[PDB]
């Protein structure tokens, strides 16, 4: 029997994962043909973009790009998950502590690692962990506490699956499919909370996130993220396709040359909750996320953008940015961001000219060296004793992003000649 690939088994799961967003949250269906269209448009419109796009393998995975949002009560939970994202070829990568911003929660984003992995199929999945001990009201955090420590996610087959993967160290495509179909079932969406409408509002009213990780089966989609060239096209189209965006949109400002990521959200849906045993139920919100990726930063422009941010609306934004290059050549030259080298049929010609310590800036304008930009495969940075509590938590540490870029870059000047 053939070995399913990793590869194989996340498309599988993205794609149904999707499905069965769509038809919990169509507003989501909707969604999708609006940024279908905006992304075609924005290729029609620029013949170049599209084709630098297709020189380097980018413009298949923007018809699959999706990341998912979910949150977890245990770190058993968040061991689990660590499990079933890794027969996917998913790791966690970063750390975001969301308490810096009020938060009860920590986390990180499981996603694929390797160049080819990333450019066959992206999927990503925010994790967040609820801590418990930020929640004020000790009576409720005793609840809260309680009712997870008491509960299981998993099902039984799906906990099997994880087991026989580990004897095998691998899958069958019978299991791969099997594995899909129940795994799914620990993201659905289900009405039907799992207290008493009491201990609901009590917990809602200490804090919504709280009752959204402690009343409902497993770990819902908290949302789907596809991605488009263009946010703010999408925002100004939204309206006309029934789907009230939100003013905000985080990240950094429009620019000729995108850094990280821009996202905004907006209601797709108010869901109903309901209570075994009783007529009367409440209701829930569920937000849907956009979101337009732009090129990697380094260490230096990460800084630069903190420092940008921490010294700022949309408008004074935009006036303070002025401050971070907007060309590719001069992110380039200081040192602001992630490119990967690529030769020329020119280049790779002269091949034998090229060497180990070279400065690229001559070699591209002679038109042998291309720098293409490395996209952004993490998340926006949040505006200790809590990091290492999550890998304790994780069972692992998590890996630096800006590790793993530096080396996709510095791969790139091997198969160049630097
Ligand atoms: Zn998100």
Redesign the pocket.
Known sequence: ANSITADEIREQFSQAMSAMYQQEVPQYGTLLELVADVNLAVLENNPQLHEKMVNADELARLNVER?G?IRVGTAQELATLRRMFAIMGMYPVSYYDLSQAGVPVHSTAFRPIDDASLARNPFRV?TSLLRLELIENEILRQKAAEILRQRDIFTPRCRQLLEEYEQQGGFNETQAQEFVQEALETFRWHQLATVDEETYRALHNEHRLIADVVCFPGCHI??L?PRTLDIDRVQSMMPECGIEPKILIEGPPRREVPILLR?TSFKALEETVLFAGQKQGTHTARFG?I?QRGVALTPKGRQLYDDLLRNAHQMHLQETFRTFPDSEFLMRQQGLAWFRYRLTPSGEAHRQAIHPGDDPQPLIERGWVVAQPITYED?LPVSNASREAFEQALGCPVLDEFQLYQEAEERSKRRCGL
Do not use: D, G, R
């Open positions: 990341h949002a925010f908290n949302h993220t996202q996320e979101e998340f």
